[PDB]
Design an enzyme around this catalytic site. Sequence first.
Site, PDB file in Angstrom:
ATOM      1  N   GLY A 193      21.243  12.940 -18.095  1.00  0.00           N
ATOM      2  CA  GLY A 193      20.586  11.627 -18.052  1.00  0.00           C
ATOM      3  C   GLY A 193      20.959  10.668 -19.308  1.00  0.00           C
ATOM      4  O   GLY A 193      22.013  10.668 -19.785  1.00  0.00           O
ATOM      5  N   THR A 194      19.662   9.727 -19.466  1.00  0.00           N
ATOM      6  CA  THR A 194      19.772   8.774 -20.459  1.00  0.00           C
ATOM      7  C   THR A 194      19.260   9.251 -21.868  1.00  0.00           C
ATOM      8  O   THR A 194      18.442  10.162 -21.885  1.00  0.00           O
ATOM      9  CB  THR A 194      18.833   7.691 -20.048  1.00  0.00           C
ATOM     10  OG1 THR A 194      17.471   8.090 -19.880  1.00  0.00           O
ATOM     11  CG2 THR A 194      19.341   7.133 -18.695  1.00  0.00           C
ATOM     12  N   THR A 195      19.529   8.814 -23.043  1.00  0.00           N
ATOM     13  CA  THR A 195      19.349   8.940 -24.395  1.00  0.00           C
ATOM     14  C   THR A 195      18.009   8.312 -24.872  1.00  0.00           C
ATOM     15  O   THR A 195      17.890   6.942 -24.688  1.00  0.00           O
ATOM     16  CB  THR A 195      20.319   8.791 -25.291  1.00  0.00           C
ATOM     17  OG1 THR A 195      21.621   9.456 -24.719  1.00  0.00           O
ATOM     18  CG2 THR A 195      20.125   9.064 -26.675  1.00  0.00           C
ATOM     19  N   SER A 213      12.918  10.435 -20.797  1.00  0.00           N
ATOM     20  CA  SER A 213      14.417  10.449 -20.300  1.00  0.00           C
ATOM     21  C   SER A 213      14.025  11.370 -18.731  1.00  0.00           C
ATOM     22  O   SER A 213      13.632  12.426 -19.033  1.00  0.00           O
ATOM     23  CB  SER A 213      15.436  11.150 -21.552  1.00  0.00           C
ATOM     24  OG  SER A 213      15.477  10.198 -22.454  1.00  0.00           O
ATOM     25  N   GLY A 236      19.729  13.732 -24.570  1.00  0.00           N
ATOM     26  CA  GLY A 236      20.321  13.060 -23.289  1.00  0.00           C
ATOM     27  C   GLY A 236      21.714  13.211 -22.968  1.00  0.00           C
ATOM     28  O   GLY A 236      22.232  14.509 -23.285  1.00  0.00           O
TER      29      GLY A 236
END
Lengths: 205, 102, 243, 250, 245, 245, 243, 233, 242
Positions: free
Chosen positions: E30-32, E75, E162
């Site tokens: 995913g996203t950090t 996240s 992430g």
Amino acid sequence: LKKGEVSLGTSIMAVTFKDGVILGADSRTTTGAYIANRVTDKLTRVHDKIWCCRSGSAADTQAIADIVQYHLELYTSQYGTPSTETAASVFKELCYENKDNLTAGIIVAGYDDKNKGEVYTIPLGGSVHKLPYAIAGSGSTFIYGYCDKNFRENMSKEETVDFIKHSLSQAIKWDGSSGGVIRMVVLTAAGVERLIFYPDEYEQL
Amino acid sequence: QFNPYGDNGGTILGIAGEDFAVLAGDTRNITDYSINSRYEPKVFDCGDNIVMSANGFAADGDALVKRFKNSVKWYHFDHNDKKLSINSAARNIQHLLYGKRF
Amino acid sequence: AGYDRHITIFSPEGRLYQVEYAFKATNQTNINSLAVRGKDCTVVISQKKVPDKLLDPTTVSYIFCISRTIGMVVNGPIPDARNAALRAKAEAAEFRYKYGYDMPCDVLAKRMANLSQIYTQRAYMRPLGVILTFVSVDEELGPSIYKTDPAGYYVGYKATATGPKQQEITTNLENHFKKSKIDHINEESWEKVVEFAITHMIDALGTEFSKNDLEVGVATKDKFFTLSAENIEERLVAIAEQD
Amino acid sequence: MTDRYSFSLTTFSPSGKLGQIDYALTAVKQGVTSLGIKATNGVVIATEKKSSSPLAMSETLSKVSLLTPDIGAVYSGMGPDYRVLVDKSRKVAHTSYKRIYGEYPPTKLLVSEVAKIMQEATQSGGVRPFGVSLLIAGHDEFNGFSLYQVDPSGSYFPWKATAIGKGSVAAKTFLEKRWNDELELEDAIHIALLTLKESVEGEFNGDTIELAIIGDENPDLLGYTGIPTDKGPRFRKLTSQEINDRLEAL
Amino acid sequence: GTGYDLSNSVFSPDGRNFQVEYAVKAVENGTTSIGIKCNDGVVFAVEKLITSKLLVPQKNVKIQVVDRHIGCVYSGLIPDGRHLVNRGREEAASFKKLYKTPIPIPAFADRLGQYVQAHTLYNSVRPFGVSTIFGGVDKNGAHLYMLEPSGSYWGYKGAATGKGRQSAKAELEKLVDHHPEGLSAREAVKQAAKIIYLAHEDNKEKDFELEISWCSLSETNGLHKFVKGDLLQEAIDFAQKEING
Amino acid sequence: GSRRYDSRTTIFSPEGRLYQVEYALESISHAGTAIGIMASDGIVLAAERKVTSTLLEQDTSTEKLYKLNDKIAVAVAGLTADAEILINTARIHAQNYLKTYNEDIPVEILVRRLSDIKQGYTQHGGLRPFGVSFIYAGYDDRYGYQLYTSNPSGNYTGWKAISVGANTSAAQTLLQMDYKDDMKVDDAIELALKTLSKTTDSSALTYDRLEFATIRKGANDGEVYQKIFKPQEIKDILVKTGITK
Amino acid sequence: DRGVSTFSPEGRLFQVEYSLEAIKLGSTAIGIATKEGVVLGVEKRATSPLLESDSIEKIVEIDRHIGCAMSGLTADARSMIEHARTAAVTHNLYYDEDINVESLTQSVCDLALRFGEGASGEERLMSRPFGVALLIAGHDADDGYQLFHAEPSGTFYRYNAKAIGSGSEGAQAELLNEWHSSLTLKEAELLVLKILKQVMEEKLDENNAQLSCITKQDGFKIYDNEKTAELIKELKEKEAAES
Amino acid sequence: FRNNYDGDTVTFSPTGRLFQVEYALEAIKQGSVTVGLRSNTHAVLVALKRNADELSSYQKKIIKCDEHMGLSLAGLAPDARVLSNYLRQQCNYSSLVFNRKLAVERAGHLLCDKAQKNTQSYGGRPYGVGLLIIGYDKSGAHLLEFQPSGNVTELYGTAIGARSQGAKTYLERTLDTFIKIDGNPDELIKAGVEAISQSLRDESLTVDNLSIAIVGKDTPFTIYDGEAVAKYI
Amino acid sequence: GYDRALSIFSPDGHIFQVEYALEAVKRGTCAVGVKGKNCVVLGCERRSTLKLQDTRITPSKVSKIDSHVVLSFSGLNADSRILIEKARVEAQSHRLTLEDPVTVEYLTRYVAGVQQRYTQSGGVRPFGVSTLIAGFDPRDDEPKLYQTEPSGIYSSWSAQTIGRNSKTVREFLEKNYDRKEPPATVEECVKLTVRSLLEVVQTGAKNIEITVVKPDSDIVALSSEEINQYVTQIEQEKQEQQ
């Protein structure tokens, strides 16, 4: 509908001193004019460093307090130790929604080691009020002048011990629904210390 | 135990004409010998060319008119934006009233 | 066997997939605990597994304070341990509210044992893989160790050990308790009991332990308290300077 | 959440079998030896209470429960199943006979209640039976002394003498000869000890054996140390010391 | 296909059902987001991915408040995050009304925590699959906590997650180690920006928008605030300095 | 998932009757026999006791014979467990009728409630049916003696002699032949005792391996006096017929 | 078999599609809307010479200006017909005026989706959606004469003509050419029957057809059988004189 | 395989997409195309009304939900209806209770929760519908994209329904022109009719059954239908 | 659970439960109703080879719903009892609220709704019995005969047959009774019904049970004896061609 009704010693207090708070009470239950109780424990622990004085109707105060005791046990285990202000709200909530049946005059006084000693006074109908010291019941108006003038912060334990013994012993004399033992509760970080003095003692002293 | 409900004044007057209609109302809102306002009408245009005043006690009035305005809104929503007639409006205002005869 | 993972039916074996695997998975955190009772104290020492420098070394806990007397060590995955901890905390307070008496170990064991049995009976809740070691110095039952295991079986113990190295620890406790001819520690001062415990633990698990590798919870009559980092150090210090 | 398993988890076949039950009956056999003798001069129950670890105490383990002051029960099978069913069995005995009818329950009628719970947890979907069989022993003036078995099936029957758990067939047999119509409670304690001796050795001592009797009792614990209203409950469970002492004279 | 992948009305032979394991794996692709604990506060930062010029700068926000002094960023799966927060609010408000105080972070953590555990003991109720970095300041200090899919939570002093986790965690531990815990709250903003900028190097086939916030006892006066204006320009300056620019 | 762990068997077969119901019938035919004979001066019921041994208490034979009323009793063929639930509800239904109309329940009225629940058990819930058939023995003052049967299919009929449980064919065949309507209680018992013999293969049949009751007019009532025989009373009648078996 | 949450690739449940197939196997219903009237014809169908006429429902009244024709199962349309009468009655109580064609349709179709143990402020509890489509005609003061096609899938289209049935193919294509903005009420009935006799494989008669129309002259009027036969007889002449 | 992550709302993937989300995304495309563009003072929706039968009559498929709010659909129409139903109720309750006029972001969040509860039981379901919601509040103009996957982004421009990519590429280019043009309707509307004509490639464009809907500072919610779209073709 | 997929369409458009329901009907007894124009005759088979039972403890084929409304069925016994209980509650509720002795059609609408109900919606499974509900509506000389199915449909019908040998009795009604011109005599209506059920029962008049309902509550069920005299007569008509 409760048949008959009950009453308590109606001159209760929490006094701040050098290292915390010393909590003071007279105790006496009467049911009419029958002396239901000479002595009583109405010096109530609601948590290990946070005690209270219960006043008003015996049936009602005890019933509330038990519920407060359940919430503050569960509260400790999960969300960390309470504060004086935390205890005070719980007491108030129960009085306010059921002020249709409840008469509770509460001083909750507890010791914290980053607020020092704390007094929160919750009268009838229920509202939280933070004060640096309290007197409550109906005998409190009569000692308002004494209390205000001799109230001093950071007074010696010996001197506070005399001051509470004396404060009540005068109050008890002039007021009529007051009587029985004077019991006192010292709250500091070293723990909880229990004082009891019988009638014949305090009158004299 | 308490009844806070009493009554307060105000006066309205409705006249039907051939091709027109008026609903005239004062702007004074009172409770007893005090003036609550000098400018506040109890008459509102509720829309679709229906004008309304529920004159008397304020507490009851304000609440009935909030209820009637949402009901007008949903009618429109569910029924192809249809005109609310004076006949429809009337019936609805009764159902609200009889809902609180208790 | 049976086919316990698709329907809640029995096995002719008597023990089901949910029970059998709950017996296994209770260690994957690389944990070992023991509990011994003193003459008049009860001590728990437990491994503390702080594996990183991204974590504070004293938010990682595995010993929970359920009541004011009662302690509970959960040996299991951490979500399951907290699921058990939450329920145990309410039951402990609810029992005090209604029955006017704080919770003892054995009654908490019983409540939870019954719950775990019901969720095995259900097809609409999962049971947990937790072994709950409840400890205190009860007012009527003396020093106490009561340990529950998953199944909904529980029983009272002299002393106990948990973890893959259970066996190593056991042989040391056995040897002491036979020698002394009693099933508790002759000592009666919780310091000396804590110190003794660590001794037998070093010996069993084969590594000398630091304060950040241990976490100590102590039970005494009418109070439960956890020992801090400095407090653990003071005990450790003596074991390092005697033969 | 609920409402996913609302088909029963016993179903029939042309052999009429109920899956869950056959598996659960097997569990009872794999328990420990527990037995019941009605001696028609009381009732005596004995079972083995045994360690499962060297640092497990057995004086925190009982298989003998009181259901009410004067009805006792013993079992073989799953430990948990027995405690949870016992709570519910206790519930109905206390609320529905001692408040409604003001007295202790009649055994046979309590046998009907306990059966009905077990049969119910099979009839209702999403849940299984209890994997135990209980022997419920009681006494009443009206019925005499009595003994029933209630199965995991929720079927019941009375049994003059029976045994369940490991070594069931042989234990019942030896017993049947040694069982007389008119049998002395001391001899009936020996026979029980003797049987449990044949199941286990090398860990068989009298302080790991738990024996309880229906007949002799102690008034001094029933609050009749003073002048009695009546004699009161007939169940009284032995301590270990009493058991060991008799084992020497076995 | 074992009923340890289609149901959670049982215990697994691996002590967890496959679908919960899978939630943990989906957080990582995913996203950090990070979280920096400091001696007087906490700082939050999250990488907001730019995929089009059709997006508006800072009129979509990922860090959402609970109360007024606890800041939450997460996240992972977007819907699951809304639902977690909505719950987080109902607890927080109930606490404020009932005890007449802002809620403690170890308390708040136990309340969300018990709810993530609940949705992981039913055979038809979806697990959560977000990892939430959250925290704030209360009357015995600042606290940084991180909540996982499985209902797992501990206190952190530095936290990272992430795509760019590896990189992020490397810089982050160096700086935390160097410092007493993280030094000033102010210094930590810039540092925080470097980690997020550094993590972005692990995904240059997209752009980022740096988003920071903070919650600091004497450096926000107990409140959680978004980090913006000058304070955001300065952290950017520091970041483009070290990672060349 | 668990929406496909549904057995889906309390739905119809193409055979015109539910799976589980048809299979359950088999279960009955593998448990104890009940025989019902309706006579012109009684009703005779015989049942052969399933397991008899010394380890059992042999002096009990009410293990399948329960009286529901003062003048109604039932015989069980099936399993104890299944039976008990319908017995208790029929008993209450008796008391509801008694209380409402000031008169005792007619045999068909009682039958009809039990049968609507048996059907119900598969009709609501999806749960499994019973494994019990009753043969009802009763008097009503509107038809004389009535002797009926119900099955977990919810179909019921009246008969002048029927058998249910194991060995229905064999017993029914013999019954149709020797039947008369000038038989007395004692003539029926003799008949009953012959039939039972011819379906059981033995050296001898003993009195404790039987459960017996007859419901006769009596000589203490113009009603019907229900006589529940116990082993020792079974022993006596065995002499009286001179039919040792 | 098939779940209440198990979709096809296109977002559409199995169960929804499957209802829609059974619709097409019913009887033929044809409606044509002009601004002079909407004419509805259906085949009533006699299942035997001993089945009595006008005991089978194919032309139903929702209200005195509002009709519906059905295709699929006849019992399944009954739960819909009930809901549609109720909606009509209630709107008239509350607002003392007529329900719009659209409004009426929406109210039934919201409760034709459903199914499963779901909820979201909508109560869903069915095992299946309905197996039936209905052509809902009405006239309302604002929009005049309109025709709406209700699918039991919670889908609704506004129409000026539609035919459904097993005779749908011939009848919709014929309807497009035949459609015009206005044409006389008597020409329209005659023309409907013409279209019906074409897609019908057998002789068309009045013992398997019932006609109906909606007028602003006198509201919902079922055009009865005796009157309809005399038109079928003219049909035989006009049709065998184009041949 | 299929049967693991289809109908099963309780499962997960290492990727986090189930089969039920990918079908839902496809379902949006099978509705008609509708494009969104906004400045900072106006928000526009241009939507093609194309009948799906020969005899069918054109009806609105942009639905005004409140004075300061509406939506257009693309995807499944029943699915679209229930949500619109809840949103109209929600609009009222905020106005009576808190006097609150919704921003798009807030509604959105509500919308995600609703879907979320129905993807936590087998008896509920996920949806099959995307929505473009426009509204003008006091934070300027807004256009939002709502997805059944719970991904909500507020955008300057987008398109959903079939053949999105024609319009997206145009919309990203004329972006810079349109956002700085404030207080002028007509240019943004015209540009929307051009965008949607690049979505079409083989499907008709109708000169009296196009429907354009606008909201803004100077525009309360108006749908231009019939005649009134002419001067923007 | 059990609130779903008991009943759903195939892609072939058959319903499982309804399709297995119609099969219980073919297997079970035979009921027929023939209408006069001032009578309705209901003839019934009850078929048992086992002779060790009476008619007075075996349930009747024609059950009274009211004195002027009767119900006949073919199918499972169990299910039919459920339906019968609703119809009696609906007769007395109608009489109470509208203050009119019952209309027979309204009662069909109630029994038919229940039948629709358990099919459309889960938490109950469907019925496996079809019914004939017949009677006279007050102030009518015109007979009413209805059929309701497990589907929950109903319609009104001039003669109708269900159960074993539906084909045979169908052919007989096609070639010997008309919708147009039925029996006008009570007698001829009796003769016809006996003729139809005699060909199929494969017994005498001792397993055909006739019940004749003439207007508004006038019901007499002819006995085995009375039917036999027509049975004799029938063997005589058939020996003009033999």
